Design a protein around this nucleic acid. Structure first.
Ligand SMILES: [Mg+2]
Ligand SMILES: [Mg+2]
Ligand SMILES: [Mg+2]
Ligand SMILES: [Mg+2]
Ligand SMILES: [Mg+2]
Ligand SMILES: [Mg+2]
Ligand SMILES: [Mg+2]
Ligand SMILES: [Mg+2]
Ligand SMILES: [Mg+2]
Ligand SMILES: [Mg+2]
Ligand SMILES: [Mg+2]
Ligand SMILES: [Mg+2]
Ligand SMILES: [Mg+2]
Ligand SMILES: [Mg+2]
Ligand SMILES: [Mg+2]
Ligand SMILES: [Mg+2]
Ligand SMILES: [Mg+2]
Ligand SMILES: [Mg+2]
Ligand SMILES: [Mg+2]
Ligand SMILES: [Mg+2]
Ligand SMILES: [Mg+2]
Ligand SMILES: [Mg+2]
Ligand SMILES: [Mg+2]
Ligand SMILES: [Mg+2]
Ligand SMILES: [Mg+2]
Ligand SMILES: [Mg+2]
Ligand SMILES: [Mg+2]
Ligand SMILES: [Mg+2]
Ligand SMILES: [Mg+2]
Ligand SMILES: [Mg+2]
Ligand SMILES: [Mg+2]
Ligand SMILES: [Mg+2]
Ligand SMILES: [Mg+2]
Ligand SMILES: [Mg+2]
Ligand SMILES: [Mg+2]
Ligand SMILES: [Mg+2]
Ligand SMILES: [Mg+2]
Ligand SMILES: [Mg+2]
Ligand SMILES: [Mg+2]
Ligand SMILES: [Mg+2]
Ligand SMILES: [Mg+2]
Ligand SMILES: [Mg+2]
Ligand SMILES: [Mg+2]
Ligand SMILES: [Mg+2]
Ligand SMILES: [Mg+2]
Ligand SMILES: [Mg+2]
Ligand SMILES: [Mg+2]
Ligand SMILES: [Mg+2]
Ligand SMILES: [Mg+2]
Ligand SMILES: [Mg+2]
Ligand SMILES: [Mg+2]
Ligand SMILES: [Mg+2]
Ligand SMILES: [Mg+2]
Ligand SMILES: [Mg+2]
Ligand SMILES: [Mg+2]
Ligand SMILES: [Mg+2]
Ligand SMILES: [Mg+2]
Ligand SMILES: [Mg+2]
Ligand SMILES: [Mg+2]
Ligand SMILES: [Mg+2]
Ligand SMILES: [Mg+2]
Ligand SMILES: [Mg+2]
Ligand SMILES: [Mg+2]
Ligand SMILES: [Mg+2]
Ligand SMILES: [Mg+2]
Ligand SMILES: [Mg+2]
Ligand SMILES: [Mg+2]
Ligand SMILES: [Mg+2]
Ligand SMILES: [Mg+2]
Ligand SMILES: [Mg+2]
Ligand SMILES: [Mg+2]
Ligand SMILES: [Mg+2]
Ligand SMILES: [Mg+2]
Ligand SMILES: [Mg+2]
Ligand SMILES: [Mg+2]
Ligand SMILES: [Mg+2]
Ligand SMILES: [Mg+2]
Ligand SMILES: [Mg+2]
Ligand SMILES: [Mg+2]
Ligand SMILES: [Mg+2]
Ligand SMILES: [Mg+2]
Ligand SMILES: [Mg+2]
Ligand SMILES: [Mg+2]
Ligand SMILES: [Mg+2]
Ligand SMILES: [Mg+2]
Ligand SMILES: [Mg+2]
Ligand SMILES: [Mg+2]
Ligand SMILES: [Mg+2]
Ligand SMILES: [Mg+2]
Ligand SMILES: [Mg+2]
Ligand SMILES: [Mg+2]
Ligand SMILES: [Mg+2]
Ligand SMILES: [Mg+2]
Ligand SMILES: [Mg+2]
Ligand SMILES: [Mg+2]
Ligand SMILES: [Mg+2]
Length: 336
RNA sequence: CCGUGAGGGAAAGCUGAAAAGAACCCCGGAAGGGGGGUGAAAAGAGCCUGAAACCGGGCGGCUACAGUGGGGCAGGCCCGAAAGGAUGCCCCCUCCCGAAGGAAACCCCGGUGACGGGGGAGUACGAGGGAGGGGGUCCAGGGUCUGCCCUUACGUCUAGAAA
RNA sequence: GCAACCCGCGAGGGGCGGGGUCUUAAAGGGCCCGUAGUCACGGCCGUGAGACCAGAAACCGGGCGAUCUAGCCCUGGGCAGGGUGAAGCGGGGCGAAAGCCCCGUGGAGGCCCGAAGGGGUUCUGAUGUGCAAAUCGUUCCCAUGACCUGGGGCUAGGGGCAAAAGACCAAUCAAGCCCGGUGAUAGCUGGUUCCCCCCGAAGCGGGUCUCAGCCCGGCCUCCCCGGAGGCGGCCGGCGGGGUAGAGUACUGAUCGGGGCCCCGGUCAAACUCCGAACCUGCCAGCGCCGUAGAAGGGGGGAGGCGGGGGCGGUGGGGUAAGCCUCCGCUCCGAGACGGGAACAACCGAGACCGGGGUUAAGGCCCCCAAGUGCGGGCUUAGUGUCAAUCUAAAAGGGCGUCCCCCGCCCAAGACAGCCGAGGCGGGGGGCCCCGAAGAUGUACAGGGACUAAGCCCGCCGCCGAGACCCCGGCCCGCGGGCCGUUGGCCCGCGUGGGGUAGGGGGGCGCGGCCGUGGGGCAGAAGCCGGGCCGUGAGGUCCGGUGGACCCGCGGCCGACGAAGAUCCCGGCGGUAGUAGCAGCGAAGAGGGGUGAGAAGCCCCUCCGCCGGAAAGGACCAGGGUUUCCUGGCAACUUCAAUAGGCCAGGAGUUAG
RNA sequence: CGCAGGUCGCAGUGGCAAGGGGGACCUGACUGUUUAACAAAAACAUAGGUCCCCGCGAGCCCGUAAGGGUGUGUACGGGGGC
RNA sequence: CUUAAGGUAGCCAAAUGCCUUGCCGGGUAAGUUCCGGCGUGCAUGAAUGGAUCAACGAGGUCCCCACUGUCCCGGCCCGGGGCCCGGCGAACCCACCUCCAGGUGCACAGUCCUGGGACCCCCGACGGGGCGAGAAGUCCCUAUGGAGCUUCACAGCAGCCUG
RNA sequence: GGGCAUGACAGAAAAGUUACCCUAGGAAUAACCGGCUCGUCGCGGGUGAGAGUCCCCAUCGACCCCGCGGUUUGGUACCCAGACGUCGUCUCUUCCCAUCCUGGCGGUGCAGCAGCCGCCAAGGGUGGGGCUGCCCGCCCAUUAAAGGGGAACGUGAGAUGGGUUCAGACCGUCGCGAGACAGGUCGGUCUCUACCUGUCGGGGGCGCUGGCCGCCUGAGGGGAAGGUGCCCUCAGUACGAGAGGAACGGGGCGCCGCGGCCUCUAGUGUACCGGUUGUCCGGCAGGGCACUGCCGGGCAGCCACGCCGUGGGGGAUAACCGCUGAAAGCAUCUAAGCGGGAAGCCCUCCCCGAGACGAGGCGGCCGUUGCCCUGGGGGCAACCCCGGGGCACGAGGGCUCCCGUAGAAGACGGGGUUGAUGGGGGGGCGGUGUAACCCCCGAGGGUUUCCCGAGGGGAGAGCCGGCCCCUCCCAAUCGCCCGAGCGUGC
């Protein structure tokens, strides 16, 4: 094998490293959470920028407990989501696949939805709800179809993004259906979904970097004593043994970035109502200003500075939950 | 024409009987193109005939869920004027003869049984060879494609070649 | 003589005898004798000649070369700047003398640093279908001298020249180049061109400066002579033999017992009292072949003189080998086809063409034609899945499980801890388990999968080749017959029909000639496509194109047939609208004019590069009109063009 | 060429231009020469040392020969080795 | 004693020591190299030159200081290639042209067997495979093949000496 | 007729050397790799003399014997001489298990701490240096441990080129000699524009049973996405005569790997600002060139030396440990049944994903139509059917346009007047460092103290932004296209 042991260069768990099929993250997994009341299990927001904050450490066993520590934070611009439709799911008896059985739309969808959808002038919502009720007894899951409101964000674009977010919180399917139907035509604000201090998972398409070489793409070494090597140094030496031929595990140049990634256990530090208190006087570089609600996340988030980011309840939460009390954010670097 | 030199050294034939060598009109910057002329024939000065490779266009067949070339059988689409048959070919029916070979239903005897034996029966049938009747329209041949079956480029030394 | 066959004569053939001659004292022996040659035409082969075609490195003859390079000679040119500081010469200081010390002056050196110039170290940099058949960048070495450089001159091939590397002597040097000897030779390598039909090998023995060659035999083929016997099989009569086994008796080896002997035991390629199977000699018979020609003999031509697989000789050797070296049958080579998953030589089996039928090996759950066929038993490990090539397994352990045999106990007081019926041990067999570990991809050995669709003992039917049977067609060998015949046709018979090298027999095509008969401007040859005929080489016809020659038949002759030779010459592709048109320290822009057309030609403005020069001034050799003017753009310039060292037309070089 | 004073920068040989230095061993004394096109060297040469053939009509070498080189020279010389 | 003598002065695990990374010191955290010693030295030694390094070195080597993108360990930037457009417009190579696995076979298959896959076409990149391309293998052997060189080979010819 | 001789004996008269080498050929024949073989090499098993205080088998294993692997070396000569690039290293990927650590279990001559031995197990780890051309090996400091093998001795059309193994040269030795040595030593060209395939990423189309939009599903595919240490407590406790000295559980944090991100810090930053050298533009100011002239600072962007995330569980199992339990009145983990049991396998988790041809589900939008020109046929009286073309209707889509969450080309995303998409203008925030003008100070000198003078101070900064906001002032225009519609059968 190798002359000297060392781990392989880069992961093959993200193979193939192709461009994401869609700029909007498509979430595969939604957790089962018992909150005691029905609620959406996720939210969507626009990444605005990064700052750093002075946060009091509230972990009693932590060596920094009670101290003020500086943490890098990510600001999300989070205008309310507009609920456009409710969809019901059952299980196909032939194979156990989850299958949509129907959906009910708001009668008068907003004009901006017409930029992406082929809609009638009016939906007859009552008939659709009536038809939906026939499938109540075979329902296993209920999701709402939400549209973003980018006009209320700092981006200012008009074309919205549309995605499904399930309703959870209680084990009873019927109450989830009743709660989802009550949301038809209404908006959902981040405070309706999350509470400050809780953990969330974040899913987004990462920043694009175009075609990149094998050194940057996989972390292969530049050939040591770089000047010695004819035909270049930013490369692998060989591209394989004699057999098997080029395998799919061989590092090769290609697209780097613009992939969908999921990161876990990011703490929500603050959910604000008015973004003027967090927007720097210069504005967020390459983004703009935040005028409505915002989410302050501890740490970094995948994606470029205008990407739509999906937050969900965690699917791998740690054994010990964070403290119930809201974290104490003393100061943020965008302030005086 | 090549080598300082001694020396070395190619390729390259054909308008038409006659120039009758293309007047004249339109277009083009021009080479030239279209129309219109000459001649038995463009044979048009890049000049007899004008093959193949090769490239363009048209036509026939195929073409994005199916692994390629060759052969046989069956079929689809297309061609099938002449030089081949059309007294053809194809289908049906009936009749006769028929090599090697050759059942079945059913009755009887045996075996646990797979099956064997006597009769039915050297029958029904059977390559092919003869005769007639009804119906149809091309048949042969060719291009290409599909299905099924078969199939390991050539030349060579070698004990041994798809190597 | 019915025939069978017997008898006589008996050319040719065979044997003797006789004769000529040589040798010898002679006998004996050698050669020769009772008839056929010679000349020609065609063919095959040998030897020479270039000798089927292509191919060396070489060697010799006579010439040509020192514009390159090596050396030397004659006559010209060049080397910024700086540093060090020899001999010699002054002054001062110390000092008793000698002398010593300091400072200066001076300007030596195959001295030092470093431009020009010369050289060529490193990056083992760039380039590596290059700018270039040796270059470029960078870093380097020398740079007043054994220094660098121009012109002229000398030394020439077995010779030169060499501060010597066998360097260099015109991109050529462990012996130049040109032409000639010369088509050098090659046991070696490559190539060697139409069809059908008949037969059909070999890699063995001997000799060889022989081992990649060749010759004489074996094996093939064709022809002729000859004339009745022959032998890959079997039975018998009469013989030969010394292997397997056996023995341990001769020659040897070797373990024990008993008193050099006796008894028991272990052995032998180079031991043998015995002794098979088996092979082999003669005779008789059988069987088959043979007068449609046995034995034997003569002549022509070979190929080949590298073999290989299976099985058998424990062959002999070797740890073993898809190993080396012998002996024998068969098969591949030179043999199609069915089965084996594939697969020259394992099994089956030998193929002219078409069709029908039946079997062989092997198979019958699906792939896949035919059985989810029949009875019994075993295995629980997916063990395994119908011989070999072919992908596997040992010593050993296991009552795991199925089974067989033996010994002992129990006569119901056995085994196990009164109860009541079987119990304990040994030996063996079947299947399976452990022993059992590998490298790209699944219980691999064809795949699916199967608890039988596995294994063992038996059984029934079916499928399945080109084999075997039958029908039709074709061809062949041999024999017979007919026909005025360098040939044609008919009949009969064949347990006739594969074939490389090679031998033998017949036909097709191409160019010409000698004859004969014809076609063609109402359309020859050629060319494109098509129909028909022939097993085939090929022939013939039709439609189109073309524009003047051509063909049938008989005979004769060749500069006579291509798919291939890193073949030759020409043309033309894919590659591909791809590489390159970057790198070496300059580059363009605006406006106007000309013009069919302008980023690029002409004019101005702006911007840049050289300036002890890849760039300004002069000029030798070499080049030879490239100079200048006018006009132009088919070609030429790595793009464009109205430009040009290009093209056309004209002109131009003045000397005491 | 020198002296005194003032003064700025991160940097005053400001760009350009322009030695890294020291210790030791092997080896050839040195400068020089070399495999044009894979070897620049410790190889060749070298000054110096030493030996040999030679008194010139010599020694050594070239030429078929006529003749020639060393030699317009002469042992403090010519030639030949190491 | 053996073909005469019998390695002297020196020098050394040497560019010369196989054994051998010899043994002991130095230097390193760690030293098969290097330096200093040691020496019956496989096989050192005197113009075949021995010992010997001042000066010199594009010679070969070890150590120290300084220094740094050599490295830890990679990042960003600049000019030209690159990529795209316009224009010009080749070559190498080429029997035909090839998805993967495990087999089989002249023993290392694109083409054979049994499997596993694949909608087709196009662009960029690379260099694992095509036993990739280049060059009738220089290695090695064979040939009753060469060339040049050597001498105690077989011969021969000059040159010199001698009658 | 006898003899004189060829012993290489079916009869030439015959020495070397080539690494300066050349030609013809040979896989008839060596060297590398491959094939066969496995003596050798490595690994496993049987046996049990003997050692182990007693005690064969905790640990060993004499004398012998049975095997496996293809990993050393050899044997052979089957393929390849019109050629498969010859050692090592670098880089990069994968596979094996006969397991060094990490997970599980057992034995011990296992008190504890350690150690030794066996079994399951290949998911992950197995590192940094010194010496030598190495490979191997020895050594140093660490470490959980610093395993071994295969892939044409993996990988030179990827590199490197130190050794080996060309031509030059030196030494020792051998040879009369030229020369030779697989003994040492110094020097000594690493060629190719990628045709096919593969791999990695990026596009166009056709299909999915009329066209389209949006949201989903999940067959299968990929994954190591995580691995592994340390400290405290337990506790100076258990154990132990002492010396010494654990563990489960609980708490905290790294190292290596993977995936993101740019707030901080660091790098860069030929946008930008300033200083300054030489020269040129007459001087000042401003500027060219010195290939950013050099130097300092530096926004955005990119980036690591920076920051963030990176888990437990469930199921069936392996080695095995047990329950009940007969065969076999007892006993027995096993024969039926049952319980427990690994970093391994599967799922959970992350990525790709309907070309998943059984081409899927859901909701919605659209089409399911007409007219014109022309050719043919039927009966001709309209008419109807068929061929070709054109136009209209029509959801949706594209080009053109302004751009950037994107980007080699394509693609993707945003905007397009019902509009803040780029620019301009104003404002915010930021870089540099304080322009011009004016006033004061200035070492000293002179037309004497109204001039020169490097420079210092004040007020004012000045220049600039590939960032944010606001504002229609300019430009997102004019336009060019694609598009289902119909039959037939099962
Ligand atoms: Mg290099
Ligand atoms: Mg013509
Ligand atoms: Mg016809
Ligand atoms: Mg007719
Ligand atoms: Mg051969
Ligand atoms: Mg062979
Ligand atoms: Mg062949
Ligand atoms: Mg001859
Ligand atoms: Mg000769
Ligand atoms: Mg001569
Ligand atoms: Mg000259
Ligand atoms: Mg000098
Ligand atoms: Mg070099
Ligand atoms: Mg180079
Ligand atoms: Mg190149
Ligand atoms: Mg100098
Ligand atoms: Mg030499
Ligand atoms: Mg010569
Ligand atoms: Mg010669
Ligand atoms: Mg010649
Ligand atoms: Mg025959
Ligand atoms: Mg041969
Ligand atoms: Mg007999
Ligand atoms: Mg015997
Ligand atoms: Mg015996
Ligand atoms: Mg015998
Ligand atoms: Mg032989
Ligand atoms: Mg044999
Ligand atoms: Mg042969
Ligand atoms: Mg077969
Ligand atoms: Mg069947
Ligand atoms: Mg055995
Ligand atoms: Mg098995
Ligand atoms: Mg025959
Ligand atoms: Mg004739
Ligand atoms: Mg041929
Ligand atoms: Mg040609
Ligand atoms: Mg071409
Ligand atoms: Mg290019
Ligand atoms: Mg310059
Ligand atoms: Mg230019
Ligand atoms: Mg200048
Ligand atoms: Mg100058
Ligand atoms: Mg000049
Ligand atoms: Mg001129
Ligand atoms: Mg002119
Ligand atoms: Mg001219
Ligand atoms: Mg400089
Ligand atoms: Mg020297
Ligand atoms: Mg050279
Ligand atoms: Mg050199
Ligand atoms: Mg010397
Ligand atoms: Mg001396
Ligand atoms: Mg001497
Ligand atoms: Mg001594
Ligand atoms: Mg010395
Ligand atoms: Mg010594
Ligand atoms: Mg040394
Ligand atoms: Mg000596
Ligand atoms: Mg010496
Ligand atoms: Mg000596
Ligand atoms: Mg000396
Ligand atoms: Mg020198
Ligand atoms: Mg182009
Ligand atoms: Mg095989
Ligand atoms: Mg191939
Ligand atoms: Mg490409
Ligand atoms: Mg050859
Ligand atoms: Mg050769
Ligand atoms: Mg010979
Ligand atoms: Mg002999
Ligand atoms: Mg190889
Ligand atoms: Mg070998
Ligand atoms: Mg062994
Ligand atoms: Mg034991
Ligand atoms: Mg081996
Ligand atoms: Mg061989
Ligand atoms: Mg081979
Ligand atoms: Mg080859
Ligand atoms: Mg290769
Ligand atoms: Mg090659
Ligand atoms: Mg194991
Ligand atoms: Mg290798
Ligand atoms: Mg290479
Ligand atoms: Mg390679
Ligand atoms: Mg080297
Ligand atoms: Mg070397
Ligand atoms: Mg060498
Ligand atoms: Mg000697
Ligand atoms: Mg390349
Ligand atoms: Mg998976
Ligand atoms: Mg990272
Ligand atoms: Mg900077
Ligand atoms: Mg100024
Ligand atoms: Mg200037
Ligand atoms: Mg500049």
């Amino acid at each position: 094998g190798l002359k000297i042991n060392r781990p392989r260069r880069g992961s093959m768990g993200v193979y193939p490293r192709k461009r994401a099929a869609d700029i909007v993250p498509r979430v595969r997994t939604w957790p089962e959470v018992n909150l005691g009341k029905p609620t959406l299990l996720g939210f969507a927001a626009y990444k605005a920028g990064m700052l750093h904050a002075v946060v009091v450490d509230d972990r009693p066993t932590s060596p920094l407990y009670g101290k003020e520590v500086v943490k890098a934070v990510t600001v999300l611009d989070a205008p309310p989501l507009y609920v456009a439709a409710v969809r019901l799911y059952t299980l196909d008896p032939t194979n156990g696949y989850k299958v949509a059985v129907g959906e009910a739309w708001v009668s008068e969808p907003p004009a901006d939805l017409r930029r992406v959808l082929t809609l009638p002038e009016k939906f007859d919502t009552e008939k659709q709800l009536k038809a939906l009720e026939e499938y109540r007894d075979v329902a296993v899951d209920v999701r709402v179809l939400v549209a973003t409101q980018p006009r209320l964000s700092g981006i200012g674009k008009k074309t919205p993004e549309v995605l499904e977010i399930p309703v959870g919180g209680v084990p009873s399917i019927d109450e989830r259906i009743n709660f989802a139907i009550s949301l038809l035509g209404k908006t959902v604000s981040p405070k309706d979904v999350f509470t400050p201090g809780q953990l969330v998972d974040v899913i987004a398409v990462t920043k694009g970097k175009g075609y990149q070489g094998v050194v940057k793409r996989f972390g292969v070494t530049i050939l040591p004593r770089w000047h010695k090597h004819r035909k270049g140094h930013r490369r692998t030496g060989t591209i394989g043994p004699q057999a098997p031929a080029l395998m799919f595990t061989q590092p090769r140049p290609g697209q780097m970035g613009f992939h969908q990634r999921t990161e876990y256990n990011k703490r929500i530090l603050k959910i604000g109502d008015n973004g003027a208190e967090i927007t720097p006087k210069s504005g967020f570089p390459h983004y703009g200003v935040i005028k409505g609600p915002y989410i302050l996340l501890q740490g970094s988030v995948p994606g470029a500075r205008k990407r739509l980011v999906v937050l969900r309840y965690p699917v791998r939460p740690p054994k010990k939950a964070p403290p119930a009390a809201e974290p104490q954010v003393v100061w943020v670097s965008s302030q005086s």
